[PDB]
């Protein structure tokens, strides 16, 4: 499988259904596809840099980077725990000037990002990452003096 | 009324992107261990069940002329071909004056000017093999197309492109048999399939699905007619970048398969002369039996109707009140002037005039016609001349010699598409539209199968405002 | 890798002593160490260039990476990317095995165990992540707001009280 | 505010609040972030048939991928995989430098402090490795 | 009591050696013409490079001990290797070359004015693709491309023949140096000494970082640095050991000196086919009078330029010094005569005038202007063409350059000088002599890479803190 | 109830096929001028390798189904391809060779010497870089590398010139085997069967595991095994199917038999430039008189060793059968004559003396000691020299060895033998006829990887436990 689909479904429908199940399946296929190729890599062992060989090699690297760079952001954003993570950054009117329903009932996830695109380059790139440092550094400052037991 | 960003991993959002696709062919070829195909040898296996999803409520824009896949596929098959003939003997030493005496069969009074007079020439030559101190006189039953008169002498001919290019003989063991190749996107990438029953090749495609792997796109390279390809659905579809422009080729996709029975009805014996240390040049020894002309059988009625269909679609595309002329290719490369393809490892330059000659008239009897007698329909036989020396389509410096396939050759290809070219030619008082069989540009052949595919990347990271807040600080 | 699995696979129990917790981290640690050694080499010789061996090491490096990635990815799917040994909420359908815990551990060795589960493997793994997701979404909505509780959490419960004195 | 290495001359404390800036560009690379090229090439096309540069770009990528992975593996061995700033139970042996926190975080910059702790790096890392082992023991008996 | 606190993302860097990749501008690929540097392979240059300034930071650079120099050295020579790898080998071409003094039998065009002997119209019987066919063919070789043989007045041969192969350069591949931007892989960085006058070694007052080098044109030139970067309001002189002799002296100029160079001869191309699919390109004939190649140089501009360098050299070797300029003593034409490439054509120019200048220590200060233009008294440099070019270091592996159709024109900017202080054994009380140098691709790379150094970034960091795990589950 | 618990790091492996990277000690890496089997690429081995003994572990090791032997073979073949790829080729030399003046004189040179004109001052009208000018040169060529042409008593050529391209090996490249440690990548492991003796297949009592294989020299030899490994306690015989006659019989000696081999001649190393930057390396003159190459075998030690394997051979086909060590049946010289490479020069040594003895167990004997240590203890092997090595797998791709200057001396360690049983009446005649064999490199690598089996380590595991994920068991 490995196909989220439901792209046409309203972002809210996608933010309510297939908001974790299909996404779990998507990642569950990424490792399978990999496992499958690995199973053959052992059988064929024709990893020789041929015309297709180099293609397979480039493809392998491309996928590795794709997964990591995504996980990297999540980890910095303190969202490595799971697919859906709530943050403490409030949404600036500049970013979007709509209502929760306007974005969930009258917007598709693709269309939604299309508008935020410009603002998104800062929403998570700077504000979200900065939020983590405050929390991280605070956690340390909090653990510096701690007594509360149960 | 307070919204806080909530990062969602797995959002169904994607972006148009170009990438390095990987081949995925049926493992049966690997098990057969033939590894003679110019590709598929290291190509990975194909997911037994193709994995596709119907993206309903999605109207992605599709453009054939802007499909990177086509450009990639082109370089791939080119590189695959170059790699296959990379470690094979070259005919650079065979570049000598060839005493092309008419073949004894050609002289034979039995075939009194019946046909094929000089088509197969018995050319003799002096060669220098591994022994650089001793020369050797050898004979090779070459073809007429491969040789070119040099001294205007009776039997003075030479291998075509002897100096213009480096003739490299493809290793005889290798097999030129296109087997379903499935181009697959690395993860995080997807191929979008224009599922529309009829698509203009450019513009928004409504009915739309996707695949992680292309369908078995056989890398069959054929000029004019498109054999063994994807059939059009219900309606013949004509696709062009600028229909108004004449320079651009016109890709016609047939809805029905015009099965073509091509054969080489000559029992042949392969001869091999050692030329260079451990390097053997393979040629023909003797033609066993009367020399007969290679031909292809096409049902006139079945094709006549085929043309009737393409003519109507062409009339709708242009002026329905216009005379349509299916003239023959007005000169050009031998590949373009005559339908060309490789059946059973031999390239058959077959005449396609009979197929593209009849000119339809508007305001006439378009009543589809049907056969009334077996002899009446018979078959459209094509005078075919086998050219072994094949130069690169878009490169002149590189030419590839073809090893003779000994024995009878025969194929059953299916005509699935046709390349055409509009040529207004200052039609007297317009009212006339001429069309000639187009060809060349390997990309044209690949476009007929990637017409629906569109590679896009995937971004499973999306931030959205949510009344919920991390609220982890407190 | 020096102490790579220093202790061999004994009864899953004896193997699951302090040995598993230590040997596993030690293996992961020394695996990281020898990998770091190879990079110290490449950072110096800088000769690895499409040679019979150069292609070998390059492909090997890629393999190790995707091999590690596949394992971690799985841990992620079923929300176990943190602790090496993570419990699940998936019950053992008797179909998977009738053996008692003692048979499973104080006798079965990880090597022969996976054999009698080879048919179940791909099934079980799918149940692990499936259950993880089922509760995950519910949990996401379960604690979605609860801002009221958070107030009492530092109003009454005083998550971070500053009243730290004696007597 | 500060650039990629903007807190290079800043004291350990000030730089501590800018850690993410560097962490964000550890894997993010020009060649990598390019994705689809405006060139006819597609993700380095076919490495241009292993060009002199084709292989270097290829090699460069693996090093970014393996290096980030090594880094992660380490924090993972130390447990705090996802976390950025962790808190070990390893007591700070004064042998590794006897300095007050004020000097360390309000005077010494990370670049300068690292030189002092350079010799005592592997020792410390293993001490964390075995501390997590002790932690795991405590957790196992707690679950029991 | 404190506890180790793992800090991920610490701003700490350490000197490292790693592979680098080129990022040429998109416009370079947009040319749609293959460049010997294969700029097409280079990744698209990021529109705006990010020059983060490292404030409160000082770093020790080693222009002479920078891996990147050695790396780029290998990269450039490998680039050329693969560029001419699949080109005609001109192997069979070498035979016996019977030659004439000029392509003009008499003063057909300008035999009197034309440099008699340079053309050396050599004719030869070469075999085409057809093995049984031999053809007499003629070609033009500058004296620098033919060696007299058999003592016969008319019998000659290719210069680097007998010795090594002389593969012709693939004609389509052009040789226009396109600025490349060596970029560090993620987790690595390049540090740029923003300090104005840097000796190439030692600490840096101002230091910045770039993930990508500034565009560097891979121009190879001798006794000069063409189209190079410019110093900052002060000519700078760098050498690992100034008190040594063999050490070549690098000089980066603060002011660019324009050098107009051209081949004033209209040429035609003749594709002599030598072997199947192998065509040797050669000059058919010069259309019009023959004029030797030259270069124009503003006496006054070069004057002031040397003046600035001379002073810097007295500052380097004791105030009181009569810095005297002299021409290369002897050796390979490469390092004896100033040579460079111009529009796909190598030029060996006799910069005799540029170094025919012995200066004392008094009255030399006055910076004379150009009151009397006199056509700028432009210095005209006698320039010739050596078609075959030997590998700078490798004895074997020579290469031929196919002729370009038509008059070639060039206008590079002088941006640097390579010098060799000769030991003051005697007669050198104050006559400090600096003969032109060169002969080493590395010396050119050091001049442009002095301000850069590559450091691995280690994001892992430890620190003591009163905080404790406090993890009791 | 029983909730499955995921355990990471479970000790589980699975027979797998993985790309292996060579790891050399990098001791001679500093000597870059020295080039041997791409040592420069081989990454320096771990300074302190550790072999974790697998206690209470038993594993099967099918040597004839090992993947390592296959990988070594492919890599070693490609290594030679890479070495000869940028080197010169003798396509022009394949000219009619007027071979005469076999020896300056047949006096002291051939008075009793068995040279009998093995070398020849062959002359030939070959061209050079000048192309136009053609010059005739003379070069001493071994009768082994030369083949007579026509009925002419002086027209000759190179054994493989007409049917195979000869590529001149680059002289700067050394040909001395180095300890190459085939190391497996992380996530994979090499099991090591430590049983004192092994049938070469079936379960293994003592089993261990190592991250890299022990140092294995890429030695290619025939009818013998040089600088190899030794068996444990006693000799071990190994075959896919011993009772089958075709299957080659692999033998591993428990004791090392020193073989002193040397070319006792001072050779001038002449060089002939043929083409631009293409110099053919040959021999100008043999300084002094010409002496044939020879190898020294301890007559007593070899008897004892042959008796040892003979006993094992009885233990394999019944004491009733007599052991008959006969000479090589016939075929290509590579196999007919024990042929190895000493000091970058390939030597062909007659092995009839080492394979000419009917042990006949019914004959009673114990061990043979050497009372006469001085003399009569050197089975001198008549060794001939060859420079044109035919490829072992393909007719083409022949290779020329540029002559070495001075005396070429070596002292390898015999460590086993490759044999061939001959099914026939001889066996019915109460006799096992074993003849030496070779020509299949796979056997050489099998003799060193015999105790190795690459397996992939899958840290992933599942296990029912009475513990549930309490992350779902949250509260207010
Ligand atoms: C491959 O496909 C082709 C295409 O279908 C098949 O061949 C087709 O066969 C058709 C007949 O079955 C034939 O149609 C006849 O065309 C003749 C000439 O066509 C032109 O002219 C007519 C009339 O226009 C006239 O008037 C205008 C002004 O209004 C003038 O400007 C013109 O100059 C003319 O003077 C047009 O209609 C056409 O479109 C063309 O412009 C006609 O003569 C013919 O009419 C009848 O007479 C024929 C004898 O003269 C007779 O053979 C034909 O059958 C017609 O018979 C009529 O009467 C009978 C009895 O009442 C009735 O049953 C018929 O139905 C009909 O009414 C036709 O119009 C196509 O021209 C022809 N096309 C080609 C390209 O050859 C071919 O068979 C097929 N092959 C296979 C193997 O399948
Ligand atoms: C979101 O913000 C935009 C920008 O202010 C609003 O669009 C403006 O609407 C007003 C009032 O009619 C106009 O005068 C402007 O010309 C609009 N500006 C732009 C940029 O479009 C929009 O109405 C807001 N949406 C809501 C419902 O809050
Ligand atoms: C090649 O053969 C043809 C046919 O025999 C020659 O053409 C003939 O030439 C003779 C003498 O000029 C004429 O009398 C005949 O009438 C010609 N016949 C034809 C059919 O043209 C030709 O001359 C020969 N030589 C060449 C040019 O190859
Ligand atoms: C060998 O054959 C003989 C036949 O006489 C038999 O007696 C003996 O047992 C067989 N095996 C041994 C152990 O020699």
Author numbering:
A (entry chain B): 520 to 669
B (entry chain A): 32 to 146, 150 to 309, 312 to 321, 321A, 322 to 395, 395A, 396 to 464, 464A, ...
C (entry chain D): 519 to 685
D (entry chain F): 519 to 662
E (entry chain E), F (entry chain C): 33 to 146, 150 to 309, 312 to 321, 321A, 322 to 395, 395A, 396 to 464, 464A, ...
Per the authors:
The envelope glycoprotein (Env) trimer [(gp120/gp41)3] mediates the entry of human immunodeficiency virus (HIV-1), the cause of acquired immunodeficiency syndrome (AIDS), into host cells. Binding to the receptors, CD4 and either CCR5 or CXCR4, triggers conformational changes in Env that ultimately result in the fusion of the viral and target cell membranes. Here we report the cryo-EM structures of two cleaved HIV-1 Env trimers solubilized directly from membranes in A18 amphipol-lipid nanodiscs. We suggest that the MPERs assemble with the gp120 C-termini and the gp41 α9 helices from adjacent protomers to form a membrane-proximal base for the Env PTC.
Extensive 2D and 3D analysis without imposing symmetry constraints yielded two 3D maps notable for their recognizable MPER density. For Tri FPPR.1, the entire MPER of Protomer 2 (chain D) and the MPERN of Protomer 1 (chain B) could be modeled. Relative to the nanodisc axis, the Tri FPPR.1 and Tri FPPR.2 ectodomains are tilted 30 and 20 degrees, respectively. The MPER density is more ordered in chain B (Protomer 1) of Tri FPPR.1 and Tri FPPR.2, and in chain D (Protomer 2) of Tri FPPR.1. Second, the highest LD/N values were observed for the gp120 glycoproteins in chain C of Tri FPPR.1 and Chain A of Tri FPPR.2, whose C-termini potentially interact with the well-ordered MPERN helices of their respective protomers.
